[PDB]
Amino acid sequence: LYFQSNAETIEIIKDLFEHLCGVRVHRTYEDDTGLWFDTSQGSKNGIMDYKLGFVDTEVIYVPLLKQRTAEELQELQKKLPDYLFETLSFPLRSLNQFYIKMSKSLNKKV
Amino acid sequence: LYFQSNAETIEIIKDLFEHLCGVRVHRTYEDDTGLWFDTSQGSKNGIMDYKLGFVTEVIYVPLLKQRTAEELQELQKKLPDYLFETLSFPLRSLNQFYIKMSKSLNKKV
Amino acid sequence: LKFKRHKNPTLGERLDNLQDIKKAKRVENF
Amino acid sequence: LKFKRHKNPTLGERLDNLQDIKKAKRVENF
């Protein structure tokens, strides 16, 4: 019957979480520092690119602004809290609180 | 010097989304009907098992076999009626679905 | 109450899917 | 304004990671 390659599954799992959660993981790798995710979350209202690292596990969050337009920044800057433009370190258990904060902050009218 | 197999990546992506979003996809397959996901979403407050199909039409089937009698009682006061039903909705509404579930599991009761 | 986390295709599954399609109540918004 | 969806390890990337660790401000709650 139907056969899914390990590769094909990754693309299906990704595709699901974009529509489900507004999150799209483009790349993952391991290095000496930890495990790293290149990430975009949001909708039509607001998109935020960022990098996620895992290192008791700490999370490192790094905002990526290179792909945003000057406008989008302006909207973003009025949309996002200050700390969300900063590079952060927080414990794993707070990650879903982070994800919610992000999605609310993008959605906020402005 | 850090080779990740296709298999290993699926597990790493799965791990991420559980902590990130409160979602965990146990199994995926295709049949003639469409594409199916066995799914548990939630936290310590409230866990809901359900089945997601894509046909774009989305099919949502709640799975109550694993919940305890108590957990049902907590759920039945937590979830809205339609969330116990078997539903069909457009794809574009799937994230609104995700949000309703997360909110409805978190609500105190 | 706190829920407990649970630890990590047959013909029956295929068939159950077909019924679930038929049963499903169409809704367009939440 | 509507954001547009964008279409889908280097030494520099590794290095930049190390910097990012060092700059990062620890926070515990949101």
Numbering used by the authors:
A (entry chain A): 62 to 116, 127 to 181
B (entry chain G): 62 to 116, 128 to 181
C (entry chain H), D (entry chain B): 72 to 79, 86 to 107
What is the paper's account of this structure, in its own sentences?
In S. cerevisiae meiosis I, sister kinetochores are fused through the action of the kinetochore-binding monopolin complex, and together bind a single microtubule. The conserved core of the monopolin complex comprises two nucleolar proteins, Csm1 and Lrs4. These proteins form a distinctive V-shaped complex, with two Csm1 homodimers bridged at their coiled-coil N-termini by a pair of Lrs4 subunits, thereby positioning two pairs of Csm1 globular-domain “heads” ~ 10 nm apart at the apices of the V. Each Csm1 globular domain has a conserved hydrophobic cavity implicated in binding the kinetochore protein Dsn1, leading to the proposal that monopolin could bridge Dsn1 molecules from sister kinetochores to physically fuse the kinetochores. A ~ 40-residue region within the disordered N-terminus of the core kinetochore protein, Dsn1, has been identified as the kinetochore receptor for the monopolin subunit Csm1.
The Cg Dsn1 Box 1-2-3 region shows high homology with the equivalent region of Sc Dsn1 (56% identity and 82% similarity between Sc Dsn1 residues 72–110 and Cg Dsn1 residues 32–67), and we were also able to reconstitute a complex of Cg Csm169–181 (56% identical to Sc Csm1 in this region) with Sc Dsn171–110. We crystallised and determined the structure of this chimeric complex to 2.5 Å resolution. In the crystal structures of both Cg Csm169–181:Dsn114–72 and the chimeric Cg Csm169–181:Sc Dsn171–110 complex, the Dsn1 Box 2–3 region wraps around the Csm1 globular domain, with Box 2 forming an α-helix that packs against the “side” of the Csm1 dimer, and Box 3 binding the Csm1 hydrophobic cavity. Box 2 is highly conserved in yeast with point centromeres, with an alternating pattern of hydrophobic (Sc Dsn1 L88/L92/L95) and polar (Sc Dsn1 E90/N94/D97) residues. In both structures, this region forms an α-helix oriented with the hydrophobic residues facing outward into solution, and the polar residues packed tightly against Csm1. This binding mode is unexpected, as hydrophobic residues are most often buried in protein-protein interfaces, rather than solvent-exposed. The core of the interaction comprises two conserved hydrophobic residues (Sc Dsn1 V104 and F107) inserted into the conserved hydrophobic cavity on Csm1. These residues are bracketed by positively charged amino acids (Sc Dsn1 K102 and R103) on the N-terminal side, and highly conserved serine residues (Sc Dsn1 S109 and S110) on the C-terminal side. Dsn1 Box 3 contains two serine residues (Sc Dsn1 S109 and S110) that are highly conserved throughout budding yeast. These serine residues are disordered in both crystal structures but are positioned close to conserved lysine residues in Csm1 (Cg Csm1 K172, K175, and K179).
